[PDB]
Paper text:
[name] appears to be the first repressor-like protein described in crenarchaea and may play a regulatory role in gene transcription. The [name] protein possesses a homodimeric DNA-binding fold that forms a swapped β-loop-β ‘Yin-Yang’ topology, and it belongs to the SpoVT-AbrB superfamily. The dimeric [name] protein, which consists of eight intertwined β sheets and two flanking α helices, forms a dimer via intermolecular associations between β1 and β3′ (the primes indicate the second monomer in the dimer) and β1′ and β3 in the flank, β2 and β2′ at the top, and β4 and β4′ at the bottom. In our study, [name] exhibits DNA-binding activity and alters the trajectory of the DNA through bending and bridging.
Here, we present the crystal structure of wild-type [name], which was resolved at a high resolution of 1.63 Å, to obtain a better understanding of its architectural properties and functions. The crystal of wild-type [name] contains one homodimer in the asymmetric unit and is in the P212121 space group. Interestingly, the two basic C-termini are disordered owing to a lack of corresponding density. In the wild-type crystal, [name] makes extensive contacts with neighboring molecules via residues in loop1 (R11, N12, and Y13), the α1 helix (K20, R22, and K24), loop3 (E29) and loop4 (E39). Three sulfate ions, which all bind to the top surface of wild-type [name], are present in the crystal structure. Two (X201 and X202) are located near the R22 (R22′) side chains, mediate protein-protein interactions, and are solvated by eight water molecules; the third (X203) is close to the β2′ strand on the DNA-binding surface. We believe that the relative positions of these three sulfates on the top surface of [name] mimic the position of the phosphate backbone of DNA upon complex formation. In contrast, the R11 side chains in the wild-type [name] crystal structure are stabilized by intermolecular interactions. In addition, the R11 side chain (chain A) of the wild-type protein is further stabilized by PEG 400 through water-mediated hydrogen bonds. The K24 side chain is more ordered in chain A, which is stabilized by polyethylene glycol 400 (PEG 400), similar to the stabilization observed in crown ether binding mode.
Numbering used by the authors:
A (entry chain B), B (entry chain A): 2 to 49
Write the structure that this text describes.
Amino acid sequence: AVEEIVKVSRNYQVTIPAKVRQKFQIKEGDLVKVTFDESEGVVKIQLL
Amino acid sequence: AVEEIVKVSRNYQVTIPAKVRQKFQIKEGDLVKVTFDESEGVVKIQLL
């Protein structure tokens, strides 16, 4: 259960912390899909 | 789906777009949980 609690920035960004990036290996410039999940009430971030 | 493709920002930040924020009420300084979901291979952002 790899997870970390973070603060939302002024311009509504969320940092994906190092702990999570060991599993979800994103870099500045990558494209990701950001979806509101209507059954879980969470936001999902998926790699393209 | 309520979703948008976004580019990862410098310093590993991902914008939660306005389209998504209409459903997922977040404000500057809110604390959120960032989780890797192994069943799906995606990151989930959860309100705390």
